[PDB]
Write a protein that binds this ligand. Structure first.
Ligand SMILES: OC[C@H]1O[C@@H](O[C@H]2[C@H](O)[C@@H](O)[C@H](O)O[C@@H]2CO)[C@H](O)[C@@H](O)[C@H]1O
Ligand SMILES: [Cl-]
Length: 138
């Protein structure tokens, strides 16, 4: 397996038609997962499943610029389960990141950071066993 937190370099940043695939298993009694697509210290796209926010399960998405979080985009559809294997696919499209979990469309996130070619790292963290992290062009 891979060590968590895991840094996946994205050479030359992201580009439409780039597909990032993360395979892992959620730990029992998990609290959180996070994917952080970074542009240096900025987080272009933070994708953050929360297993217990006031006894609710929610996915929080956001952008961090100059160390400040912006407006949260929340998704109540929650395909993850403690103890279970998952696949997250993030497809870069011209105007948004498109996320599918276990082959089912989950959400889209409009590009706030527009210099796609400078989003050159993906951090993967949280309460998971990480099996694989890779990318390909479709
Ligand atoms: O927005 C992503 C960011 O959220 C931080 O937590 C927020 C929390 O979601 C919000 O309800 C409250 O008003 O402010 C907190 C601090 O900004 C997390 O700390 C951070 O890790 C990100 O997940
Ligand atoms: Cl930008």
């Amino acid at each position: 397996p891979l060590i968590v937190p895991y840094n996946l370099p994205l050479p030359g940043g992201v580009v439409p038609r780039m597909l990032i695939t993360i395979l892992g298993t959620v730990k029992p009694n998990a609290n959180r997962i996070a994917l952080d697509f970074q542009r240096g210290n900025d987080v272009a796209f933070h994708f953050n499943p929360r297993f217990n926010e006031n006894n609710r399960r929610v996915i929080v998405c956001n952008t961090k610029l100059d160390n400040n979080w912006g407006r949260e985009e929340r998704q109540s559809v929650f395909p993850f389960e403690s103890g279970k294997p998952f696949k997250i696919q993030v497809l870069v499209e011209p105007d948004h990141f498109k996320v599918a979990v276990n082959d089912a469309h989950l959400l889209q996130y409009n590009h706030r950071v527009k210099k796609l070619n400078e989003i050159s790292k993906l951090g993967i963290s949280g309460d998971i066993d990480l099996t694989s992290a890779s990318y390909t062009m479709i």
